[PDB]
Design a protein around this nucleic acid. Structure first.
Lengths: 151, 208, 100
RNA sequence: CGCGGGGUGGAGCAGCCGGUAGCUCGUCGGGCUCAUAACCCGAAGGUCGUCGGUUCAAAUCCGGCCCCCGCAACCA
RNA sequence: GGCCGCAAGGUUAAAACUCAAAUGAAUUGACGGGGGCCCGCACAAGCGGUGGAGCAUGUGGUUUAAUUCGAUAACGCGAAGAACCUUACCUGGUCUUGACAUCCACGGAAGUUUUCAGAGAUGAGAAUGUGCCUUCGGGAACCGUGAGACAGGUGCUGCAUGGCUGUCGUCAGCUCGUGUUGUGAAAUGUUGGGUUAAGUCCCGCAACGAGCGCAACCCUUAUCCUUUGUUGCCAGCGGUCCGGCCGGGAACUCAAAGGAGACUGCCAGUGAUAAACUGGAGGAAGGUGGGGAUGACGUCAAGUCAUCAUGCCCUUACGACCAGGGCUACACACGUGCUACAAUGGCGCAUACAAAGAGAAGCGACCUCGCGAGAGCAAGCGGACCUCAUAAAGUGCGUCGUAGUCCGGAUUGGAGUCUGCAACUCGACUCCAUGAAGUCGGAAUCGCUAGUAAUCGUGGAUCAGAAUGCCACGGUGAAUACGU
């Protein structure tokens, strides 16, 4: 907004692992304020993922996230007659969010049956460095690279 | 229709109610109707008498009317002759035992409703509306109103294009809830049409 | 509303007042499962015979001042517009603008 | 009469081998538009003048007829 | 026409005809694809929609005997509820001082019961009564008849009006008095430096003051204390049918009534020795704490003569009564909603946690019957007591396994329940069957910054019956705001 920047609201860490990031992810996943179901789904995803990759539940998730975080995104300035997409260094708070969102989107897209399962699959893909979220990230990066002349 | 009614917004705080009784959902509508009737009757009767506020108050299947008027002498007539007469008719209207009290209005220039009525009367008898308005404002000021506003509207001087004109003097705070703003209205049924007269009289602020 | 409409309403009310005992009885008879068929039939026919304005489902609640059919309130017996006016004037006891 | 162009979606300009059946403005539809002209999306309008035949592809190659053009020649 | 010029043209220079202006400077506005500063879900950042589907609903149109009239910041709007009524419209059948009032004249007490014809309106019969008072020419309530004076009109004008309403906009503005400047329209104040949500506040300054508004006072919500404890409560006591139910207790919740509390008051820094700003301390709450009410001068000849009132037209009819029909029509276009398209789900069984309301021609337990809507019986209750009244999403266990499906419910057939004189046109709900379209929607387009959106149920008004609408209530409960 114009007038005043405001302090981001307080977020509680999830009961299972005691993590803020996890909680955020769960929130993102959630729909129609049905938090509980969403959190259950998330947990399920984690468990399966853990089983698959070993490690811990949280650590694996973190790793997955890491492979889909964008260093740089673009924005539309459009000062000229035609529009110029300009790259911008995307901040720590935002980058984490974006990756999560992308993952969620991928999960939603995916052709597997249960939501949780789909999510798990997505996570696995991210970890391995294939899939939808990763592709999206690449695209984002690619665009930035293309428009690197603007800065 | 911008403005809130100045009496209506203040009923909980500085202004009181006119009809002052309790009734259950059963008898409430009927009571209201009765009140409307009696009030209407009173207005019809005591037009020549300068009457400001009829306050109805019914306890224990018996109606207590309180007529605020500038000149009791005309409303009372001979001592307990006219009042008595009024009473039985009131009772009839209600269908219960009636009791009429008559409060004497000190300073009828500061009572808003009365002023409005006067203005209307003046309009009816073909005076210059503006001069009447001025008189209304001036008089109130003289009497010790912290402020007064009056407004008149429509077919002023029998003109084809209707308009509103208004005179304020002193201060008349309407947004301030604690301000004693005596508001009231009237209508001059002239040869060219109706001329509505509003008047706000600010007595002062109440501290509690 | 018109005068005529008001008059009609009044008439209807009067009719209702008149024929209540009979009509109610008839209704009861019609309902009563422990009763003769012929009797029931008679009752049904009897009801038809009675005037239509005798029914309470015929009469419309109008404003007691203006006779306006719509925007009515039961507690006050007045149409919204008149009710508001009353409130403003102080004429409805206890009623004031509500905020929460 | 003879000889060169050919004959279409409301008008017009439609990719040498017969299997492609249009594009412009137009009318409707809806939001853009401070307004319409709009930009953009989609939708109704054929016979391919006609009569036939070579061939599953035909209006699309040929035989005749009706017109539109253009021809240049003629006229006691 | 002359003179000049190679020419282009120059120079000299009319008239008819035509308009009541044309112009100059400055003034107040408005506007600018001028400029500066600032704000708002204005964009950006996000989440969910609308536009496609079916249905609901309003409008346009068309149709109709009529599809009532209005609204067109109109279009789930007036209408908080059209079967009859409502109703204003159409078709017929009827009435004409009249359905509604006042006034006399004079016939009859009002009224009460019942009969045939008629769609009904109405048009004809049989039973009762004579009350308050009379130098008796009779009266006030309530029917009857005729005369007129009048009634009546949801008939026209919102561009004659009042009242009420929308709107820019809860935008921070709009003015006035006196003084001064200018021939004057006007200006100044009200601009300028900062600051603020704010013409908020300070400082300056030909201004000095004032008013209406920007704020505060009001309701509500967040913490505490005192008072009062039933129909509300159960911490500690005894008893127990393990139910606050009964002795009791007044603690706690809760209920109202009255107080306290938040003021940049306290601390540090920045700032012009300031107004303020930035942070922190305490605190339930912090910088207007959250929400509501509150809408300046005015604008739109904005809306409403169909709420009401109010300044030409109809008066054996543009008034009144009635029955039936219509307002629910249907090639189509638009608006606002609901339900969907599924697995963050559907179905089945178990099971937990609300708030806020309503209720006497009313809400209706329990029990019995009905597959069910409901029916019968029938307590408790004008209600912190009784009833509406099981909250649902949720949670656990099972099942279905991506299908036009155990998704989706339109549509239609049968049979029925309730309300109501009456459900054909045209009500709601139930059961059994039937099982359309629809697999996230083109161009475009809307809402929302927090207990918000999203989603889940619950209640209320109008109301016999008839909500997916409106107005309320709690449950769960996000994302995002770099910035201009």
């Amino acid at each position: 907004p114009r007038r005043r920047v405001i302090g981001q609201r307080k977020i509680l860490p999830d009961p299972k692992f005691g993590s803020e990031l996890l909680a955020k992810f769960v929130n993102i996943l959630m729909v129609d304020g049905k938090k509980s179901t969403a959190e259950s789904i998330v947990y399920s995803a984690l468990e399966t993922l853990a089983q698959r990759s070993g490690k811990s539940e949280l650590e694996a998730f973190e790793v997955a996230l890491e492979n889909v975080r964008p260093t740089v995104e673009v924005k539309s300035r459009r000062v000229g007659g035609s529009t110029y997409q300009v790259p911008v260094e995307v901040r720590p708070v935002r980058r984490n969010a974006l990756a999560m969102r992308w993952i969620v989107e991928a999960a939603r897209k995916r052709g597997d049956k249960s939501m949780a399962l789909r999510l798990a699959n997505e996570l696995s893909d991210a970890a391995e460095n294939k899939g939808t979220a990763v592709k999206k990230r690449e695209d984002v990066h690619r665009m930035a690279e293309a428009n690197k002349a603007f800065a | 229709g911008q403005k809130v009614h100045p009496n209506g917004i203040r009923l909980g705080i500085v202004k009181p109610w006119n009809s002052t009784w309790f009734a259950n959902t059963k008898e409430f509508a009927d009571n209201l109707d009765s009140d409307f009737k009696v009030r209407q009757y009173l207005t019809k009767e005591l037009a020549k008498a300068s009457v400001s506020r009829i306050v109805i108050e019914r306890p224990a299947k018996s109606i207590r009317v309180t007529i605020h008027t500038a000149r009791p002498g005309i409303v009372i007539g001979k001592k307990g002759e006219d009042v008595e007469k009024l009473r039985k008719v009131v009772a009839d209207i209600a269908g219960v035992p009636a009791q009429i009290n008559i409060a004497e209005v000190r300073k009828p220039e500061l009572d808003a409703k009365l002023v409005a009525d006067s203005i209307t009367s003046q309009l009816e008898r073909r005076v210059m509306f503006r001069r009447a308005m001025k008189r209304a404002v001036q008089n109130a000021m003289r009497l010790g109103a912290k402020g007064i506003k009056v407004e008149v509207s429509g077919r002023l001087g029998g003109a084809e294009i209707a308009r509103t004109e208004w005179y304020r003097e002193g201060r008349v705070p309407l947004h301030t809830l604690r301000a004693d703003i005596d508001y009231n209205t009237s209508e001059a049924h002239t040869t060219y049409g109706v001329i509505g007269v509003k008047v706000w009289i600010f007595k002062g602020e109440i501290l509690g | 509303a018109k005068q005529s409409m008001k008059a009609r309403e009044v008439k209807r009310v009067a009719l209702a007042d008149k024929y209540f005992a009979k009509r109610a009885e008839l209704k009861a008879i019609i309902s009563d499962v422990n009763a003769s068929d012929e009797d029931r039939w008679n009752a049904v026919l009897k009801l038809q015979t009675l005037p239509r304005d005798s029914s309470p489902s015929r009469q419309r609640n109008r404003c007691r001042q203006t006779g306006r059919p719509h925007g009515f309130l039961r507690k006050f017996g007045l149409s919204r517009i008149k009710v508001r006016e009353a409130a403003m004037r102080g004429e409805i006891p206890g009623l004031k603008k509500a905020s929460w």
